Amino acid sequence: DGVYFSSYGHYGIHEEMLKDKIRTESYRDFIYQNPHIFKDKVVLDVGCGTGILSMFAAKAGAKKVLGVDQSEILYQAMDIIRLNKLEDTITLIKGKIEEVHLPVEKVDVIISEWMGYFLLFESMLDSVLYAKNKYLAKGGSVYPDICTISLVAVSDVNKHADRIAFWDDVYGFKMSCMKKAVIPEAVVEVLDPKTLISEPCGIKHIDCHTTSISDLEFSSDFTLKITRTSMCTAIAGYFDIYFEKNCHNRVVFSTGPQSTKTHWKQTVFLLEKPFSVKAGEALKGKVTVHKNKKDPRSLTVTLTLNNSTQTYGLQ
Amino acid sequence: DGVYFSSYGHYGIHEEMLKDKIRTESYRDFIYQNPHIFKDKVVLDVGCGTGILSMFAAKAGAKKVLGVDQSEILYQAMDIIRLNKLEDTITLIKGKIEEVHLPVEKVDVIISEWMGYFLLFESMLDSVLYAKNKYLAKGGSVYPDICTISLVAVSDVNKHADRIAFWDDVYGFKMSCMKKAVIPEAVVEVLDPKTLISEPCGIKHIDCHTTSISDLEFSSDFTLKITRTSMCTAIAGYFDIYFEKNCHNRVVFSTGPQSTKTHWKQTVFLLEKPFSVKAGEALKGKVTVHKNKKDPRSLTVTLTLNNSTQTYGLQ
Ligand SMILES: Nc1ncnc2c1ncn2[C@@H]1O[C@H](CSCCNC(=O)NCc2ccccc2)[C@@H](O)[C@H]1O
Ligand SMILES: Nc1ncnc2c1ncn2[C@@H]1O[C@H](CSCCNC(=O)NCc2ccccc2)[C@@H](O)[C@H]1O
């Protein structure tokens, strides 16, 4: 989509992503501490951006790195690779991974940073799975290989009031009809871990080696173990990223609220009707994640909890 | 423009603007403390958004309020006015102020919140001046009536290094070619007032009663009185808003770094080549503000200082 690749044309998003130390050091450590994965191999960097994953792979001893991006950032990547004198190892190709012509039939390794808010926002894993099905050699590997999504309950009456009740009295005037636009929009924000009132519950496990495209729309029945008697005002979502297959030095990071903040923050679903929970309670709910019918890069999250159902949107 | 009015269709920008207490209380105080300006008058709210200025004017005793917005937010304004039982005083009209049909020939008062980053970003004052020339009755008033733009010198080597030098060494790789995209982009951020190294210099005075459209593209020769021997790394811009004409209770707010933060923050122009200044020095420069030839809602700021010239863009 023209709007989608246009946004990634600007250096601003690439600066934010590169300055995310948890993200950037995790990939750096994965590659530098497992050079047996890259030594003398053919590597495909899907959505290479500025191209630093391709340069990591070269440093780790890749025979050949193919960096692919549809964004205009690829022209910056070309200059960056030339500035670093790596043009004999790294080839950059402008286009969608779905339609570009590659100068090889097969690659030994696919690496990518495809993750959106709540993991699946932007639907870029579909592109990586296209690349894997078409190009990954027999016995090849895709990294990161394992991803999880988790939910956790939140009590934060003040944050709820600031976003919702706010619209009841604005300098004496009623603006209550605005609440209808607010509730269905998922909020991307850093969550104070003091406001967590449950143990986390895993709602999705993905292995990029065995997952199909169709698996990326899913339902889960979840149980949240309530740890604090309180008013439940929201459910928050986050994701964990693992580098595992054939690793001597496994790497993990979490985007959860108990972990150092990343640029992905946490995804918060505000409850239209907050409700009381008790420590020890097993809170049962159902969550379904779909691609938005209108824009398949946008997500729909359907949440059933406390005998009420709300659908939330990520952009 | 479709992109422009689309952005103002979402409640998010209206929430941010309404929660800016300095902005919102300034307009509230102006209207509530000068009701003689509104009593039994016909009022035009140009770009009414959620419509709360129209409701302020009604409370202050307006005979008739016409709220105009091209954005889809106008449908929310219609519901808000009905919820407050003000539909007999306030009429909302969907369209551009340049082309809508008004049910009156003339209005006594125009009120608007048209100000962008560095005052003139988005070029919405052109629309307010259209409305004034077409609709303002003989002896009518436009608010806010007086605006200034100021510049101030900054020393912040660390912030400069974080935005510019950062690209020289990214995990051992050279990304110096990215600096070319960064320098020309004006930064909108809250400036630490401890990093100011000059007295402010006014570069523009606008009275909305007498200013022409053509006056909104301007040049100024400025002098910054340096107060701290230091490395000058940036020039910051901000603006002041006055309610004056026929006021018994005059109202002012500043978006400057010595004042409480607003959603407009400050506009920062990073210098490609920081240079040394001395306390007592009279630093002479020239600044020109133009509409972007490609998109006239975008600004071009041409800065000459220390015998070097850089053009900066606001989106
Ligand atoms: N179908 C597609 N075909 C081709 N390109 C596509 C497609 N879908 C999306 N894209 C691009 O994918 C990127 C995603 S954002 C990651 C940038 N890469 C990056 O920082 N690498 C360095 C790095 C450093 C440390 C840790 C991780 C990564 C954008 O540039 C999109 O334009
Ligand atoms: N040519 C045009 N014709 C018609 N509408 C146009 C045109 N150019 C821009 N617009 C609209 O102008 C608004 C600017 S943003 C201020 C919203 N109003 C607001 O908060 N009022 C309440 C308030 C409270 C306290 C203090 C001040 C204000 C947007 O909604 C645009 O869609």
Swiss-Prot record, chains A, B:
Residues 1-315 are annotated as: Mediates interaction with ALDH1A1. The keyword Cytoplasm applies. It is an enzyme of class 2 (transferase). Changing H248A: Loss of interaction with ALDH1A1. It comes from the Eukaryota. Coiled coil: none annotated. One of its GO terms (cellular component) is cytosol. It catalyses: L-arginyl-[protein] + S-adenosyl-L-methionine = N(omega)-methyl-L-arginyl-[protein] + S-adenosyl-L-homocysteine + H(+); L-arginyl-[protein] + 2 S-adenosyl-L-methionine = N(omega),N(omega)-dimethyl-L-arginyl-[protein] + 2 S-adenosyl-L-homocysteine + 2 H(+). It is found in: Cytoplasm, Cytosol; Nucleus. GO terms for biological process: chromatin remodeling; methylation; negative regulation of protein ubiquitination; negative regulation of retinoic acid biosynthetic process; positive regulation of osteoblast differentiation; regulation of DNA-templated transcription; transcription initiation-coupled chromatin remodeling. Its main location: cytoplasm. GO terms for molecular function: histone H4R3 methyltransferase activity; histone methyltransferase activity; methyltransferase activity; protein-arginine N-methyltransferase activity; protein-arginine omega-N asymmetric methyltransferase activity; protein-arginine omega-N monomethyltransferase activity; zinc ion binding. Residues 1-315 form the SAM-dependent MTase PRMT-type domain. Keywords: Acetylation, Cytoplasm, Metal-binding, Methyltransferase, Nucleus, Phosphoprotein, S-adenosyl-L-methionine, Transferase, Zinc, Zinc-finger. The keyword Lipid metabolism does not apply. S-adenosyl-L-homocysteine binds at R23, G47, D69, I97, E98, S127. The active site is at E113, E122. Its EC number is 2.1.1.319. Monomer and homodimer. Interacts with EPB41L3 (via FERM domain); the interaction is direct and inhibits the protein-arginine N-methyltransferase activity of PRMT3. Interacts with the 40S ribosomal protein RPS2. Interacts with ALDH1A1; the interaction is direct, inhibits ALDH1A1 aldehyde dehydrogenase activity and is independent of the methyltransferase activity of PRMT3. Interacts (via zinc-finger) with ZNF200 (via C-terminus); the interaction is direct and required to localize PRMT3 to the nucleus and inhibit its proteasomal degradation. Protein-arginine N-methyltransferase that catalyzes both the monomethylation and asymmetric dimethylation of the guanidino nitrogens of arginine residues in target proteins, and therefore falls into the group of type I methyltransferases. Catalyzes the asymmetric arginine dimethylation at multiple sites in the Arg/Gly-rich region of small ribosomal subunit protein uS5/RPS2. Also appears to methylate other ribosomal proteins. May regulate retinoic acid synthesis and signaling by inhibiting ALDH1A1 retinal dehydrogenase activity. Belongs to the class I-like SAM-binding methyltransferase superfamily. Protein arginine N-methyltransferase family. This is Protein arginine N-methyltransferase 3. It comes from Homo sapiens. The gene is PRMT3. The chain holds residues 217 to 531 of 531 of the full protein.
